[model samples]
Target: NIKGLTQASRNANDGISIAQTTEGALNEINNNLQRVRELAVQSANSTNSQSDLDSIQAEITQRLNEIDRVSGQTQFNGVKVLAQDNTLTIQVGANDGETIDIDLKQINSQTLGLDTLNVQQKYKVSDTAATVTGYADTTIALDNSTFKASATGLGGTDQKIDGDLKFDDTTGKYYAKVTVTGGTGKDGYYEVSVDKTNGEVTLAGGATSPLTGGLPATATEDVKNVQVANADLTEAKAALTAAGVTGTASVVKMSYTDNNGKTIDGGLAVKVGDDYYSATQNKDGSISINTTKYTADDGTSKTALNKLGGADGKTEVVSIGGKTYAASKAEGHNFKAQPDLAEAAATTTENPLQKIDAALAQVDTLRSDLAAVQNRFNSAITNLGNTVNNLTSAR
Candidate 1:
């Protein structure tokens, strides 16, 4: 019986030690919770700027994570005190079943309701008149690239899917990350097809696109390169007249850069005048005047081509024997095509005051429970030790 009492006494002491360790962890966690409240209060005040609030939130996250760290890590004899079962079974008597259970609280961010604490506000901007680059300049520090809204022609207006779209200011377009939540194929990026004539966009709807692994193949986009011709309308007209082409030759104003970094002014047009047969061109690239009326399709490449010795509207640009990449670039002294987006003002509507208050109350309750368990363990230890001593003395 004395041996049993001695062992029981030792077990009770271990219980006391474990309780004290848990209490220490909770103490630090309480302090951090208090810090979080202070920061939340400061963040809620009107005087704080968006950056100020964000800074406060950053610290609050650190503290809350630290509280999580303390609760989950606090241990005794390789056993987690706050994470595992709260009731600790202590051997308090001289029998296999002679045990007492000390009740403690499970503590962590989740238990304390600090898991989702967010006390700072964020900024968002969407002005179709304003380009994304213009507004984004103001929020350079924010992770605002993923936060998006879209506009017309490029897609739907105000199509706000948070973190799904990216706005390009130069193109005035929005690009979305299309991922398979659950689709027919392996994870991959694919493309949508569009009609060049009607400007209608669609999925790969015909045999022209082959499917792979139950998904459509990726589609590539096409962009035409335009450049100004090196010759002006007067030179283009002279060249056309020299070719024996007679009619109203008009100018197509275009500008393009040569490989030598020189800007050239080029473009001219030949319209049907008095029964001209579409201003016919000869095999040697010269025009032959005709007196038979025929249809003609107008084009944008007219004047630029005439000066570049490239007046043929149907130039086989991609054929191996023919290519006309010589004249392709944008005309300039370019106008400001789109308005810059005004910088979006940063503001917050977050209120963590009540959340912190509730969390503090929860911490209080947990701490109180921990203290009660520590006291209980201590009382048991003292009584068990006294019993052992009295038994030894009587013997």
Candidate 2:
């Protein structure tokens, strides 16, 4: 009788002990779960201060570690309450039929999927400058060999040269009338009177006489002021041949990106040709070119120049950074830049605020689950208490 009494008491006591162990573990898990949930909430809050965000991260990491420790430490005797297999059975009624089964899922950085966090930041962009190079001469040489002649003969020997009366003689009364063409005037003519008796000459429109070399005057009366010739004209021919006249300047290759980022490829200088093109800054922040000075090399008609910059040179795309800009294919330089030219490159990534919200949702779900299980454990404890009391009283 004594042995049986002792056995029944031991059975009831053991049931109470098992219930207490399970309840203790459930309570500890709830505490740790609540801590982890609060830490996640803090981490999700956006803060302008970097130091505040950093503090939250540190606290979250610490709580995560604590959760791991609590999960591993939770056990009842040799059997774990928070089982690795997520299965545990507690003797709630001192018999196999009166037992509570518990299933607890693992909780850690790996399971929660919070091992890594990517926080988004503002985008960064880079800027660049315009490029330019050295200059090359585009001077075009001209032909200065052709000359038209009109002159007087010696001893007043009058003759009609080009339908003009003239003579060559070294005397005040009888003189050689020298007519010169291509004298840099719009009309291209210059005249001189030479004395047959003394072989001296003077400009037809000037008061001075006795010019150097003592024959027909060596200088024209035109704005060109070049050397002319006596009745022989040998020196004048040489002078015209050696004049060395040149055309406009040209570019080899040129390109630029405007403030608006529009690209301008001026092409080869040979293709574009040399012209008196100039660029100016416009009020609207664009560039204007003066292509009026550009003319075709072969003709006086503005066809080629018009092609370089339509009639009003301002019609072409103008220069921006350095030198000047002109379109080889078209006339009138007026280059408008791309509107977004100065815009920096923008960078982007996943949205961090949204990601934080997702993380918070996950943590809240975990906490709710933990709370549900904790409630179940509490109910089991109450049932165990009733069962233990009934068994003791019945024995």
Which one is best on lDDT?
1
In the range 1-395, model 1's lDDT, one tens digit per residue, is 67877788788778778777877887898899899888877766777654465578679768976886787688899777777556778886777877767666666666666655655443321111111112111112212222222112123222222232233333323322333333333223223332333333332232222234432222122222111122223333564575455775532233333323444432222332321122233342334222211121131222222122211221111101122221221121111331111111122324567767777887677667767766776777788788878988895
Q: What TM-score would you give candidate 1 relative to the actual structure? A: 0.43
Kindly report which residue stretches of model 1 are placed more than 4 angstroms away from their true locations once superposed: 125-351
Where is model 2 more than 4 Å wrong at Cα?
1-41, 90-98, 112-395
Error of 1 at 298 (Å): 61
Q: What is the lDDT of residue 261 in candidate 1?
A: 44
Predict model 1's lDDT versus the native: 0.46
Native-referenced Cα lDDT, model 2: 0.36
Number of colliding residue pairs in each model: 13, 28
